[PDB]
Amino acid sequence: AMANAVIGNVVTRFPPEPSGYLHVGHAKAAFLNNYYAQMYEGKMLLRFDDTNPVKYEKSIIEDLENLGLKYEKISYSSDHFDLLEKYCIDMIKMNKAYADDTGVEDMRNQRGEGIESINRNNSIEKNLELFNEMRKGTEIGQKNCIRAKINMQSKNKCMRDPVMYRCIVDVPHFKYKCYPTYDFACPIIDSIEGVTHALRTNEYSDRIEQYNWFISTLNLRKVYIYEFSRLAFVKTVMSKRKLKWFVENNVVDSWVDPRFPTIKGILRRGLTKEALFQFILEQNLMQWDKLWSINKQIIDPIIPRYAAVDKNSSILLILTDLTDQVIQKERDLHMKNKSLGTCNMYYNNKYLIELEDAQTLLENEEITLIKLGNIIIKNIEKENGKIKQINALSNFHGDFKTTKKKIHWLPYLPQQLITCTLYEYDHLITVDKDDWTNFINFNSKHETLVYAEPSISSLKVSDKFQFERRGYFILDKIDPHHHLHLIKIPDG
Numbered sequence: 001a002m003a004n005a006v007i008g009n010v011v012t013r014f015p016p017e018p019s020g021y022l023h024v025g026h027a028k029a030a031f032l033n034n035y036y037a038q039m040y041e042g043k044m045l046l047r048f049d050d051t052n053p054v055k056y057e058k059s060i061i062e063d064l065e066n067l068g069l070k071y072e073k074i075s076y077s078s079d080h081f082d083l084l085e086k087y088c089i090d091m092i093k094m095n096k097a098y099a100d101d102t103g104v105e106d107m108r109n110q111r112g113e114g115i116e117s118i119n120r121n122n123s124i125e126k127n128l129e130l131f132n133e134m135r136k137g138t139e140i141g142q143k144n145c146i147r148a149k150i151n152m153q154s155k156n157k158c159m160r161d162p163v164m165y166r167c168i169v170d171v172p173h174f175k176y177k178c179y180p181t182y183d184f185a186c187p188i189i190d191s192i193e194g195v196t197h198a199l200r201t202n203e204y205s206d207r208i209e210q211y212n213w214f215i216s217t218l219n220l221r222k223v224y225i226y227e228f229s230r231l232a233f234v235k236t237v238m239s240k241r242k243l244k245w246f247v248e249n250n251v252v253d254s255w256v257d258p259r260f261p262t263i264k265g266i267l268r269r270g271l272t273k274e275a276l277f278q279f280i281l282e283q284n285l286m287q288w289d290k291l292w293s294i295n296k297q298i299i300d301p302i303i304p305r306y307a308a309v310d311k312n313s314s315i316l317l318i319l320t321d322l323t324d325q326v327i328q329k330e331r332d333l334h335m336k337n338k339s340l341g342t343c344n345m346y347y348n349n350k351y352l353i354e355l356e357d358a359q360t361l362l363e364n365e366e367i368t369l370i371k372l373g374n375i376i377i378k379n380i381e382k383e384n385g386k387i388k389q390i391n392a393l394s395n396f397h398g399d400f401k402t403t404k405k406k407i408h409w410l411p412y413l414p415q416q417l418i419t420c421t422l423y424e425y426d427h428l429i430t431v432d433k434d435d436w437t438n439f440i441n442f443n444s445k446h447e448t449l450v451y452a453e454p455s456i457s458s459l460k461v462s463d464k465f466q467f468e469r470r471g472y473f474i475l476d477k478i479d480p481h482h483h484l485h486l487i488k489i490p491d492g
């Protein structure tokens, strides 16, 4: 619900702090801002919220690009520090703000007990003196903050004289020695940037009364607040500190690791932006499984299908009636989607099949090799207990419909088969949500070496596809000697 929204006059803003990498929760915020802007044919601003001193701008902009979220203009909170100072002074002159040198603990217990600080009654001229001490960075100023004068007895703790301005000399941004708080800066900056609908998380809904109080007390143009719920996932860390620990201790080898909930992370993992947006629209800690099922339903109709077998469990099958001449046939990349085009299939008398499949056959069973035809299994050579080889006869014109058992396969053409590594990942932690390192899966990157069809040479980095009867994958990397690294996409 966007209050009084008018087509062509809606302005939202996405306000990420430029102190970290965007993650999936940020994505819900950025997407809802864009979605309401587009709904009303309006504008979405990008504001780097650097209100308090602590270069990720490029990462953030690149992730906004990758999600297809455009914005009309980029600004920084700090662009308005001058004007915020002016407004702080105006509020002192209206006796709506005062300089308080009370310590933090006693301020908090005074606030909890509705006790007005003795400084609440400071004169205007004294309040201004003390604000200037804060601006100059003196020890006097470092002892003081500026609070708003609202209502200490209010049932809303955010209306009990919230801090507006603080003296921060300790750390660099050293130009300013006092800084507005987020609670004071946000309504003011939203007003002066022309925001009409300021989106905000569910957490602390008490601050809306405060935000409106700042707007109206300064007689600024009104801004509506819309609220949405935070997006958080089970078995997922999103703290900056915890992610930092993972990286520094070589649990992952970068901040783009496909187990990370960063935007880069889960796009590398195979997620489409359409899947994320649709999940947000059609939906506390969420379960990943509906997100990955929506991804599966989105990607399955528009990705090619290839075959792969385990490079070392796979067993040799020989159709003894054929020769070693390699026959080539054109086939569809997608059986139900002719637009994805064709590739080349190659066959001979020698094949590789999966050992889990080969253990399931018995003499003179009829089965099907997908995209090729039927075969009659004749002999199972078991040397030293394990299956060593399977001999069968071609029956390519027999009816595959009469077969309950249809399997995938590779031609045994090793100078043409492409070697690949499958990376299957799991959650970095084991519980849903200080000894926390006791619950890390230090072994959540399972690798499998496989052969894949020659035609898979056609793929480019980041293409998605399906391995027959294996699952869904994204091409992450291409090695020297044409060796591919493929990440399994979860499918719910």
Ligand SMILES: Nc1ncnc2c1ncn2[C@@H]1O[C@H](COP(=O)(O)OP(=O)(O)OP(=O)(O)O)[C@@H](O)[C@H]1O
Pocket: 015, 016, 017, 018, 024, 025, 026, 027, 028, 029, 049, 199, 200, 201, 229, 230, 231, 232
């Ligand atoms: N898990 C989440 N789900 C949805 N939106 C989020 C989530 N985390 C942050 N956001 C939204 O992302 C935007 C910027 O977040 P950022 O962390 O950069 O600022 P912040 O000051 O730390 O605010 P927050 O304390 O909410 O994270 C804000 O609109 C924020 O409310």
Ligand SMILES: [Cl-]
Pocket: 163
């Ligand atoms: Cl406080």
Ligand SMILES: [Cl-]
Pocket: 227, 228, 229
């Ligand atoms: Cl919501």
Ligand SMILES: [Cl-]
Pocket: 250, 251
């Ligand atoms: Cl390691």
Ligand SMILES: [Cl-]
Pocket: 253, 254, 256, 257
């Ligand atoms: Cl990596």
Ligand SMILES: [Co+2]
Pocket: 038, 041
């Ligand atoms: Co339109």
Ligand SMILES: [Co+2]
Pocket: 018, 055, 056, 057
């Ligand atoms: Co910066």
Ligand SMILES: [Co+2]
Pocket: 139, 142
């Ligand atoms: Co000092």
Ligand SMILES: [Co+2]
Pocket: 288
């Ligand atoms: Co799971």
Ligand SMILES: [Co+2]
Pocket: 323, 324, 325
């Ligand atoms: Co020959």
Ligand SMILES: [Co+2]
Pocket: 396
């Ligand atoms: Co024939």
Ligand SMILES: [Co+2]
Pocket: 426, 443, 444, 445, 446
């Ligand atoms: Co595992």
Ligand SMILES: [Co+2]
Pocket: 479, 483
């Ligand atoms: Co390698």
